[PDB]
Scaffold this motif. Structure first.
Motif, short mmCIF file in Angstrom:
data_model
loop_
_atom_site.label_atom_id
_atom_site.label_comp_id
_atom_site.label_asym_id
_atom_site.label_seq_id
_atom_site.Cartn_x
_atom_site.Cartn_y
_atom_site.Cartn_z
N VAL A 1 81.46 78.32 -50.07
CA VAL A 1 81.61 77.68 -51.38
C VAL A 1 83.09 77.47 -51.68
O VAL A 1 83.79 78.40 -52.08
N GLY A 2 83.56 76.25 -51.48
CA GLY A 2 84.95 75.93 -51.73
C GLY A 2 85.43 76.43 -53.08
O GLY A 2 84.64 76.63 -53.99
N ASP A 3 86.74 76.63 -53.20
CA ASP A 3 87.32 77.12 -54.45
C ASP A 3 87.09 76.12 -55.57
O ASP A 3 86.88 74.93 -55.33
N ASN A 4 87.14 76.60 -56.81
CA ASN A 4 86.94 75.76 -57.98
C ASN A 4 85.57 75.09 -57.98
O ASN A 4 85.37 74.06 -58.60
N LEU B 1 76.75 69.26 -49.34
CA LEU B 1 77.23 69.52 -47.99
C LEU B 1 76.07 69.81 -47.04
O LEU B 1 74.95 70.06 -47.47
N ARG B 2 76.36 69.77 -45.75
CA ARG B 2 75.36 70.03 -44.72
C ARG B 2 75.94 71.06 -43.75
O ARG B 2 77.02 70.86 -43.20
N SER C 1 69.45 74.60 -55.63
CA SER C 1 69.69 73.28 -55.04
C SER C 1 69.82 73.32 -53.52
O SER C 1 70.15 72.31 -52.90
N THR C 2 69.56 74.48 -52.93
CA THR C 2 69.66 74.63 -51.49
C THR C 2 68.28 74.73 -50.85
O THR C 2 67.34 75.24 -51.46
N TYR C 3 68.17 74.23 -49.62
CA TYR C 3 66.91 74.26 -48.89
C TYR C 3 67.16 74.11 -47.40
O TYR C 3 68.25 73.72 -46.99
#
Lengths: 107, 51
Positions: free
Chosen positions: B37-40, B15-16, B47-49
């Motif tokens: 952070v969506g469920d499940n 996602l962005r 992995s984020t930057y």
């Protein structure tokens, strides 16, 4: 002299900064923000956050570093230098005079 | 494995996020994001930057 720098237990440093003096240091674009200490620093001031040039007694961003200010050993160092310069000037004069005299005589 | 690994329903891989608020100071830049952070799902910060 046998003077062992440095005895005094050391500071551990300032952290928050600006510890040193007459570093001078420069701003942004800016340039020339005056050495910590001096009157300019004491006065709360506005307009220096985002603009160059000098809005203080000392300036232009052309001349630095670590401005020899007030009186320290350096002032004596500056004063000593001044004295030396004066002596040199005096010596020159004398020489000139002598020469002139000689010439005259010859003629 | 053919089960209990990947999901079958639609879902982005990366996602962005856009700044919900940003302040451009004379010598600093601050921005706040609402990392959701969506469920499940499970997000691994590594992995984020910041682009």
């Amino acid at each position: 002299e046998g003077r062992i720098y440095v005895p005094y237990v050391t500071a551990r440093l300032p952290k928050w900064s600006g510890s040193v003096q007459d570093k001078t240091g420069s701003n942004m674009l800016g340039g020339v923000v005056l050495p910590p200490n001096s009157q300019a620093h004491r006065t709360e001031t506005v307009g220096t956050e985002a603009t160059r040039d000098n809005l203080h007694a000392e300036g232009a961003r052309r001349p630095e570093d670590q401005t020899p200010y007030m009186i320290l050993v350096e002032d004596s160092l500056g004063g000593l230098k001044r004295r030396m310069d004066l002596l040199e000037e005096s010596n020159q004069q004398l020489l000139a005079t002598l020469n002139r005299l000689r010439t005259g005589l010859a003629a | 494995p053919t089960h209990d690994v990947t999901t079958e329903r639609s879902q982005r891989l990366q996602l962005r996020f856009v700044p919900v608020d940003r302040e451009d100071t004379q010598y600093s830049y601050k921005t706040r994001f609402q990392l959701a952070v969506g469920d499940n799902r499970v997000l691994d910060m590594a992995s984020t930057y910041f682009d």
